[PDB]
Amino acid sequence: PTYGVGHQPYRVVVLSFELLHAPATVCGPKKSTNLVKNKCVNFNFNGLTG
């Protein structure tokens, strides 16, 4: 503890995400909505918005 501020221990946690190429396993909190067809809508499929 007698060291300076440039020599203190630092705990590092690195979160590495894999982008969506496979089926999604981990996903954030969002409320699902029933599917509609043959209408111009705004879709959010697994984080892909259009």
Next chain:
Amino acid sequence: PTYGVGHQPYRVVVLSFELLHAPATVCGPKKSTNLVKNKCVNFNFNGLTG
């Protein structure tokens, strides 16, 4: 006081300046110069130079 360095209180002051559209009211110590005309000069009117 026993909490970590990221959970400390922080005093925040946000200074929002609104831009010059009205007559200017609040600004600092720049010494004014007498106005001369009919000559190519460098003018500084309320902060805008030319």
Next chain:
Amino acid sequence: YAWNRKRISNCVADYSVIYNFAPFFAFKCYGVSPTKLNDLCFTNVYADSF
């Protein structure tokens, strides 16, 4: 107001041993990169301290 200037010439500059000498966070450089200081090399170094 009376900062000290030192000339560094005719030696072999190891910049990887600066870090364990003073407790500073960032080796803030402008025209070069701190990790690439050994591959490229210079003519003269001037060190100013205040």
Next chain:
Amino acid sequence: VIRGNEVSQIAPGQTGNIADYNYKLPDDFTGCVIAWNSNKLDSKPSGNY
């Protein structure tokens, strides 16, 4: 756990000691890094070994 000088070494496209021989990140990295001080939990007056 690293020291304070090498926190800037955990970044894509870096060289040194941690980024060359200990922990290397890819150039196409998509993710976050969280580093915080541990002067109380990971430090001893006699020296942490």
